[PDB]
Ligand binder design. Structure first.
Ligand SMILES: CCCCCCCCCCCCCCCCCCCC
Ligand SMILES: CCCCCCCCCCCCCCCCCCCC
Ligand SMILES: CCCCCCCCCCCCCCCCCCCC
Ligand SMILES: [Mg+2]
Ligand SMILES: [Mg+2]
Ligand SMILES: [Mg+2]
Ligand SMILES: [Mg+2]
Ligand SMILES: [Mg+2]
Ligand SMILES: [Mg+2]
Lengths: 164, 164, 164, 164, 164, 164
């Protein structure tokens, strides 16, 4: 028997599909950075894409743990070009903030149905999203300071290219 | 400057998106096996999905290596239900034979244009596909023998669930 | 279901039996050399016989990998006697060159049928044959220098006797 | 000079060719098991075939050790189809019992000629045949009990596939 | 006996002499960089020159393996000067692209003769050329970004000076 | 600024190109020993050829150390054929004696100019030339004791083929 409601199960399945799209968007940003010759930023984005797949799978295993099941939906075609490095990381921040709000909406839906197990499960993602948004804000800050200077950009590209 | 033809880039780009679809299909098979309580079969498919990502990224990196650019496309919704374990594995075999023909068509195209670099790059996929088809054919032959006997299926689930 | 044509499977199965005979021929050479007290030339021929069996088993596993089966045929009696050291090795070389041409014929047949999997599997043997032929030519060269001087042949015997 | 009679030499040379045939017979049994999809039974037979070849080379070396010469004969085409698993192993047991009687005939011939060296040398094979026949009788007993039940047959396959 | 045709042996020997010139051209680029004070760039070229010698020796050993003979020809004086760092690396890329087409020409010749051993042997060079051209394309892309800014040139020089 | 006289720089640059020719000559000799089936002698010459390049590069580095530049010149085609093993090594010895006298001429020139730094630099090559000459003479003496006995030639081929 499924002990999440269908409404909560749908919200969770929807978020899992959003996490898959996040992964794909970030790979698309890698394709841009690689085309522009910034292999470090592209590497950063490939690691981020893998990271989003772990989020997808966290939702996956929770849905099954609660007796639901996962239905994978079509993945929309992501954007594949940006007006520059900053424009790309700004889109990432905007995306991550939208993901944060999507998670908040599930949390409030679970709280209104008194699904305390799902409220509690989602705490992990609330905390993770703080980290996710702020790592992008940090990079955007460095790019605002570098102000186009290839000297600095080179070293940032190499720094982010070290992400484990 | 791009040293692959536009027609070969498009074939390689297309195949990269087929590898992503292949990854997603196998993840959908996992959602089905998990919904049916076969955590070992599902585990096997999750590993297969990750393996297909490695194929996509081999295409990714070769395209940039030849001066091209990757464009990510929409990913179609895969089926999410099969008529039992053997049906899912028959579909998987059919999918891998389709992938193999897709790979053959690029090789032949590349050969016709005398793109020896791409013909040689594609050898690795030719040899991998043979291994991929064989792995599924072997699982199918065992399930044909088992004739749905639950004790045989349980041992096969535990074995596939140990895949690294 | 078999994914090689019957024609290609027959070609491979025929070459499998050819590798078996190659093994037996070289053992027969070991019987000649062991008879003339050359225990080192005999040791080399017994190593070559064991290597031909690895060749046969490589075709074996590929045939089954592609859904065919193997049928073992009768093995013709090999020659048991040779006019001298260099008479035997020149039969070796002529045999290995016949093997190479048989391999080439399978390659061209597969290529004509667009069986890229078999064309690629055969690359391994095309490269080994280069080595198999070269090792005999080298030995014939060392013989055509020693000019029957048992002092040198005590060393040539000694050296082939060290083959691992 | 030869210090075995020609009759004892012919007896030993015949037995060497018989062990070569034994090796080929078990390899044919492997082609059957693999065709039937039992890679563990097939593995056991491949290991047997390699062992039947150590037997041949022991005769080989004794013959040269007594001043005789080996001559390799044609090898007959082995059977390639059995009715089922148990029939193949039964044919294996029948073959080993025939090999045992063949060894006995040499022993009794060497004993008549007072060739005490050959008599002593053959004790190894006598004792070894006891083990070869026993190991096949054990498998047959398990297969009799399995009574065609595929759940059990699969368990035997896996076990015999671990043979070292 | 030489088992390669004279036309193929000539093409191969010609390529070998082309690899020697390649080595010498990169040494000459080293002489230019060392004169301009870029020890790191010069170091990169000195390692590249040693790498071309391994290419030459690979060709050398294959020729003798197919019963042919190597004849060393005169080496042209390479250019001694370039109009800046980018100019040198553009010359390097143009040379490696010419080397790649030279190799392609041998492969198409060997394939027309059905000289499969040589077609197969040249695969290694087809794959290596992909990397040789791409490593130079990557250097040229960073140099474009640096745009003559010495603080970035120093960064690239010390990095290329790390090449092992 | 250059602190060697242009005359000394031209002599050093000339010798650098002479060491490059020496490397090429010794490789040509390897082409001859390999054509003749003496792989160990061929091996010795290949090792000598690499050693020759270290000599070249010691001149290279000293020229830049004194503020000069290197200019690479064309490399003449070497001979490829000797009348026998001893003929090749006699030619090697005569070449090295020529190199020794070329080095002496540079030392005498530098001495005439009171270029004490270059005089001292060249001491290394004076001592090394004594060795390079001695090792060819040792080999010629062993060839003379061998007196065409292929027994001994084979042992020297193998010994020289062990050179590190
Ligand atoms: C070099 C690092 C490469 C990272 C590749 C990241 C790829 C993410 C692509 C997103 C596509 C999603 C659709 C397939 C999902 C498969 C999930 C398998 C998870 C077990
Ligand atoms: C050193 C002795 C080698 C003699 C070979 C003679 C060939 C006769 C053919 C007999 C069949 C032998 C079967 C070989 C089985 C190999 C199975 C290995 C598993 C990979
Ligand atoms: C470590 C040395 C630094 C760079 C070496 C540069 C060589 C330039 C090209 C030389 C041309 C003459 C050919 C000599 C061939 C030597 C063969 C060696 C075989 C292992
Ligand atoms: Mg996420
Ligand atoms: Mg794939
Ligand atoms: Mg063979
Ligand atoms: Mg036996
Ligand atoms: Mg090269
Ligand atoms: Mg020198």
């Amino acid at each position: 028997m499924m002990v999440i409601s269908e409404k909560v199960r749908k919200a969770l399945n929807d978020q899992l599909n959003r996490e898959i799209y996040s992964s794909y968007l970030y790979l698309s940003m890698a394709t841009y950075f690689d085309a522009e010759g910034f292999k470090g930023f592209a590497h950063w984005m490939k690691k981020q894409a893998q990271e989003e797949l772990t989020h997808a799978m966290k939702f996956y295993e929770y849905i099954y743990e609660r007796g639901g099941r996962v239905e994978l939906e079509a993945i929309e075609k992501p954007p594949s070009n940006w007006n520059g490095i900053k424009d790309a990381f700004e889109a990432a921040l905007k995306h991550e903030e939208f993901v944060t709000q999507s998670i908040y909406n599930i949390l409030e839906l679970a709280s209104e149905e008194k699904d305390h197990a799902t409220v509690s499960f989602l705490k992990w993602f609330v905390d993770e999203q703080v980290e996710e948004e702020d790592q992008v804000r940090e990079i955007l800050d460095l790019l605002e300071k570098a102000n186009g200077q290839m000297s600095v950009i080179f070293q940032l590209d190499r720094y982010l290219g070290q992400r484990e």
